[PDB]
């Protein structure tokens, strides 16, 4: 359950998600990269589940890099409460995702096993994903 | 230190530039003393007098008497150049000793400030 | 000012010869001597300051100045702007005379002293020494002494480097390391 240890402000605005992912579209740390073709919100629970499935598949044979962190807080309102009377608290944290953004990277493992693990992680995640080979340029 | 001396002269320099009057700036060294009159624009020298002048070059420079002389000659030069009302600029030097004698000579010899 | 007279005539030339300095002006000299007596007890009982000023004035030969604390610490319980320490600055002719008196009498009377550590220098050519007991100096009188207090002495030298600073002291004869 990734979460910032402390934050300057408890609550944050909803914001708008637009544009392509110009930064973070290139794989650096690891040879094997998984990218998101669709924009959306990535929850900490989603990140944890994908990490756990990838770790189980690798069985300590490869190194995993997480390029997504849920710094942004999300406020949700409780049931049987009228609209207004103040903003709700941060039930959960999400990471804004843009098309082409790096989610996970793998190194030190065979391509086929990495592809299978990335397939499992994609199945868990809400984003369409295409595996991309790392390119120098 | 010349750095500190310029640091403590800038207040008066800026206030005189705001006033927009001709400025009688002094600059004294252990050997020589110089006085010159700068235009309100701050980039034109219209009158000058130092102990490098031939009249008092081969003499007791770096002295209160030399400062008094330089004041008298720059006062005459300013009178001949048409300047009558200036703002004194000790240029960070304490208004005292050679600077004070220079200022008093200039003030008594035609210039009023 | 026997040392002041001696330094220009003898010591300066031999320092230049010993260090093989290209130019005479490079040769170092002692710019200032500073004495510091910081005590925490002062400014609370308020009796310490008078005796400290008396002994410091008697030893130094100049009127000392009372510094004011610029910081407040909860652990030390010092509020802003209190007179916790006293210092004096000696230079030139009077400094050379003080240094002569110090070399003459102050260090020898010190009990259980063999020498000064060679690492005391900060590396920039400055020298610092600490005197355990103020009584060592002859100016103060043991009979009418309220309490014993230690002192700090600092010597400032133009040379930027410790080897030349130490050679400058050696020419003067400051007790061997």
């Amino acid at each position: 359950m990734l979460q910032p240890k402390r934050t300057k402000f408890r609550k944050m605005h909803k914001g708008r998600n637009t544009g392509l992912a110009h930064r973070g579209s290139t794989v650096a740390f690891g040879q094997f990269g998984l990218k998101s073709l669709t924009r959306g919100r990535m929850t900490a629970r989603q990140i944890e589940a994908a990490r756990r499935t990838i770790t189980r598949k690798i069985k300590r044979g490869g190194k995993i890099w997480i390029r997504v962190f849920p710094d942004k807080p999300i406020s949700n309102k409780p049931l049987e409460v009228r609209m207004g009377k103040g903003k709700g608290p941060v039930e959960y944290w999400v990471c804004e995702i843009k098309p082409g953004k790096m989610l996970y990277e793998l190194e030190g493992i065979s391509e086929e096993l990495a592809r299978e693990a990335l397939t499992l992680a994609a199945a868990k995640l809400p984003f369409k994903t295409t595996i991309v080979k790392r390119t120098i340029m | 230190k010349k750095a500190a001396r310029l640091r403590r002269a800038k207040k008066t320099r800026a206030h005189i530039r705001f006033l927009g009057v001709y400025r009688l700036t002094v600059n004294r060294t252990p050997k020589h003393i110089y006085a010159q009159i700068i235009s309100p624009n701050g980039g034109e020298v219209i009158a000058q007098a130092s102990t490098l002048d031939g009249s008092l070059r081969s003499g007791a420079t770096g002295n209160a008497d030399a400062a008094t002389s330089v004041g008298q000659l720059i006062a005459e030069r300013a009178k001949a150049a048409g300047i009558t009302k200036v703002a004194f600029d000790r240029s960070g030097f304490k208004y005292h000793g050679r600077v004070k004698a220079l200022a008093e000579a200039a003030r008594e010899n035609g210039l009023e400030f | 000012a026997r040392l002041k007279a001696l330094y220009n005539n003898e010591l300066k030339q031999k320092i230049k010869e010993e260090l093989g300095l290209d130019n005479v002006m490079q040769v170092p000299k002692i710019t200032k001597i500073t004495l510091n007596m910081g005590v925490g007890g002062a400014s609370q009982d308020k009796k310490l300051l008078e005796g400290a000023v008396a002994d410091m004035t008697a030893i130094a030969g100049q009127k000392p100045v009372v510094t004011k604390a610029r910081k407040s610490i909860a652990g030390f319980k010092i509020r802003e702007e209190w007179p916790i320490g006293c210092k004096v600055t000696l230079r030139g002719e009077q400094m050379y005379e003080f240094l002569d008196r110090l070399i003459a009498v102050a260090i020898p009377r010190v009990r259980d002293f063999r020498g000064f550590s060679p690492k005391a220098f900060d590396g920039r050519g400055n020298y610092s020494l600490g005197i355990k007991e103020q009584i060592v100096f002859p100016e103060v009188d043991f009979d009418k002494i309220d309490r014993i207090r230690g002192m700090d002495v600092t010597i400032t030298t133009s040379a930027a480097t410790d080897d030349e600073g130490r050679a400058l002291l050696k020419a003067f004869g400051f007790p061997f390391k």
């Binding site: - | - | 008697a58 030969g61 009127k63 005379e97 008196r101 003459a104 260090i107």
Partner: protein, 55 residues
């Protein structure tokens, strides 16, 4: 050196009997007994030990 705000400061002669050495220097200390010195007469304070004799 501001006037009148400083301690009494005067010539003093410091001698070591064991080393038989005379030193001349100005010190605030005052001595009841003085030794004659060819240059002039200034007060005497005895020294138990001297730097030169000190090992």
């Amino acid at each position: 050196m501001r006037k009148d705000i400083h301690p009494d400061y005067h010539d003093v002669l410091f001698h070591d009997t064991n080393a038989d050495v005379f030193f001349l220097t100005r010190s605030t200390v005052k001595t009841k007994t003085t030794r004659e010195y060819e240059g002039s007469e200034y007060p005497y304070y005895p020294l138990d030990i001297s730097s030169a004799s000190h090992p």
